[PDB]
């Protein structure tokens, strides 16, 4: 129990991974636990990609994007790419491809969440995607909870990175570098 003042909900299983017992408002009771776990894991992965993207975008740019995008931007990049796609430029169709492929993956992984909710053999979050085998092979390490801790950090971190540049023109590396 993270907070002794507010108890951990009984519905939350102690055995499930990543459990610190921090549910002060007891939101676990309202929704299915397995679905809540899956939503958390999926949110962590999407957030982790978004935050590194923010840092990497400042440090490195792929060739030729400089013409189609403003020199320093974050969500502005999305708007800029969309502006050229709506304009009719062939080259700036990045958004449609990302949307299409992520959507296709979501469509074909759709039965997994429902199947786990019906007590299916796969546990929440394991799509068995370990080609290298090094990270999750055999006994494994603390990497299973490492993903959860880094993912939660990524969620709030994305929130911070996005919220900055909304009130300012500074990007992630720039805002870290100089603070006013």
């Amino acid at each position: 129990r993270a907070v002794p003042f507010a108890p951990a909900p009984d519905c939350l299983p102690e055995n499930i991974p990543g459990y610190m017992g921090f549910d002060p408002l007891g939101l676990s009771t309202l929704c299915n636990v397995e679905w809540l776990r899956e939503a958390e894991i999926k949110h962590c992965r999407v957030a982790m990609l978004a935050a590194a993207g923010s840092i990497a975008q400042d440090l490195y740019q792929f060739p030729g994007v400089e013409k189609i995008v403003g020199s320093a931007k974050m969500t502005g990049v999305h708007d800029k790419i969309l502006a050229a796609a709506s304009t009719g430029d062939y080259k700036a169709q990045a958004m449609s491809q990302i949307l299409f492929w992520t959507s296709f993956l979501e469509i074909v992984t759709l039965p997994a969440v429902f199947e786990t909710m019906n007590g299916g053999p796969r546990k929440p979050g394991v799509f068995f995607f370990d080609p290298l085998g090094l990270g999750k092979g055999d006994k494994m390490g603390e990497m299973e909870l490492k993903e959860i801790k880094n993912g939660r950090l990524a969620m709030i971190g994305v929130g911070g990175m996005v919220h900055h540049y909304l009130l300012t023109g500074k990007g992630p590396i720039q805002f870290l570098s100089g603070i006013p």
Binding site: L110, P111, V113, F114, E115, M117, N118
Partner: protein, 90 residues
């Protein structure tokens, strides 16, 4: 007064339970309640989007948006099938 014929494959569909037997879904008798529920929301969103995109109708409507607009009523039948399958344990 004489035997009334029915097509081959006619089965009994009268129900007094909470939900009808999955046979009332025809070819969709084996689809899961999650799959109807996700198809229900998907058809509702895509059908509503396609319907909205052609509300001022012109002499040149996009045929894909017309065809996609038929997903809105189809979603109603999908969520009914989702309730039937959830209450049959599928």
């Amino acid at each position: 007064f004489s035997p009334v014929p029915s097509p081959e494959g006619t089965k009994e569909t009268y129900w007094e339970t909470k939900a009808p037997s999955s046979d009332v879904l025809g070819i969709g008798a084996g689809v899961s309640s999650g799959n109807f529920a996700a198809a229900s929301v998907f058809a509702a969103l895509v059908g509503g989007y396609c319907t909205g995109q052609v509300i001022p109708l012109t002499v040149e409507p996009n045929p894909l948006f017309l065809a996609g607009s038929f997903l809105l009523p189809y979603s109603w039948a999908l969520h009914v099938a989702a309730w039937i399958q959830k209450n049959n344990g599928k």
